[PDB]
Design a protein around this ligand. Structure first.
Ligand SMILES: Nc1ccn([C@H]2C[C@H](O)[C@@H](COP(=O)(O)NP(=O)(O)OP(=O)(O)O)O2)c(=O)n1
Ligand SMILES: [Mn+2]
Ligand SMILES: [Mn+2]
Ligand code: NA
Ligand code: NA
Length: 325
DNA sequence: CCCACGGCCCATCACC
DNA sequence: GGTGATGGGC
DNA sequence: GTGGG
């Protein structure tokens, strides 16, 4: 909340570049600037002060100057008033509609929730589910409900096979009081980086959760990755909101790089890979690998904790609750 | 000045 | 029909 | 939009 007025401006500018301009690198630029400003311990009094930070350059500093002088930014006013940009920005709030589809709809004169209902025939399955649960999907999930969800997922997973390990990651694991969705990491001793020892590994768990009517809809489903919709049961009382759930099956011998990754935050992961590279390592969601002189990655290093990955790249260990960058 | 900007799974659509 | 191309998501 | 090169 120290520099919240600035980070809101930068976030809104970022979304505009992603959704409307389709400039993904500008989007990331703004997001980067917002994050670096966000973990800055003094409250910014001028743009030149902010320009000291990496990620904040000339253009953003100007915008910070204009904002601190007037409490708003003209560029954002023009954007909000512009009706095509407005329409396109809104449609992307529907799951399954990205910058491309949103722009295509608006060009056809389709630019509201009602217009989407009226033209439902033009939506794919994903976009239809997103439209259906539009309100629910923009609701935060209180941590109290996450724990109820966690209990159910962990248990039904046990009911299929007790050797399964299901770990809730994401913002939940970072100890957030509310989450946008539920992220589940799944492993089994059969599945390592050396085979396909079980087929239907992810299917069994998905199917079991559908059977107890916890999972209600499927957005996508393959052999290692499920993207879908879930809902808590009601005791008798108003229904719980339908929630987004992601399930990711990962080789058991790569569990810790997996849980590090799926815990996030997404920007923290960009920071960690960025530092890891300066220290002669390449990290992804699966492994950490050393680099030779030529910039050629060796074979995966041994990992048996999250702290192990931190030690290689010589970072002091940070609790998941301190990765919300 | 100029360019690189963590990446891969899954669904669908254009094209043959 | 099978594909390669692309979008959307994490 | 930014910073390293
Ligand atoms: N581009 C991306 C997208 C996601 N991720 C990782 C880090 C995230 O913590 C994890 C899950 O993403 P997520 O569910 O969209 N957001 P996250 O759980 O961190 O916070 P919420 O908005 O869900 O409450 O995937 C990433 O590293 N790079
Ligand atoms: Mn999440
Ligand atoms: Mn998620
Ligand atoms: Na700077
Ligand atoms: Na969307």
């Amino acid at each position: 909340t120290l520099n919240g007025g600035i980070t809101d401006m930068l976030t809104e500018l970022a979304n505009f570049e992603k959704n409307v301009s389709q400039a993904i690198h500008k989007y990331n630029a703004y997001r980067k600037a917002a994050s670096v400003i966000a973990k800055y311990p003094h409250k910014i009094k001028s743009g030149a002060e902010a320009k000291k930070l990496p990620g904040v350059g000339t253009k953003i500093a100007e915008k910070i100057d204009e904002f601190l002088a007037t409490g708003k930014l003209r560029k954002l006013e023009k954007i909000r008033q512009d009706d095509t940009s407005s329409s396109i920005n809104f449609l992307t709030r529907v799951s399954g509609i990205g910058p491309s589809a949103a722009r295509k709809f608006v060009d056809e004169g389709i630019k509201t929730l009602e217009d989407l209902r009226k033209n439902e025939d033009k939506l794919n399955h994903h976009q239809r589910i997103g439209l259906k649960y539009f309100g629910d999907f923009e609701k935060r999930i209180p941590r109290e409900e996450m724990l109820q969800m966690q209990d159910i997922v962990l248990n039904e997973v046990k009911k299929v096979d007790s050797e399964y390990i299901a770990t809730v990651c994401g913002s939940f694991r970072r100890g957030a009081e509310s989450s946008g969705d539920m992220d589940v990491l799944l492993t089994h001793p059969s599945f390592t980086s050396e085979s396909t020892k079980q087929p239907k590994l992810l299917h069994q768990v998905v199917e079991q959760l559908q059977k107890v009517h916890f999972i209600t809809d499927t957005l996508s489903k393959g052999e290692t990755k499920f993207m879908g919709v879930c809902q808590l049961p009601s005791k008798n009382e108003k229904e719980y909101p339908h929630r987004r759930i992601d399930i990711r099956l990962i080789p058991k011998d790569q569990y810790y790089c997996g849980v590090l990754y799926f815990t996030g935050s997404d920007i923290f992961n960009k920071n960690m890979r960025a530092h890891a590279l300066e220290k002669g390592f390449t990290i992804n969601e699966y492994t950490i690998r050393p680099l030779g002189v030529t910039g050629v990655a060796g074979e995966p290093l041994p990992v048996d904790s999250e702290k192990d990955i931190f030690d290689y790249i010589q970072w002091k260990y940070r609790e998941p609750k301190d990765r919300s960058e």
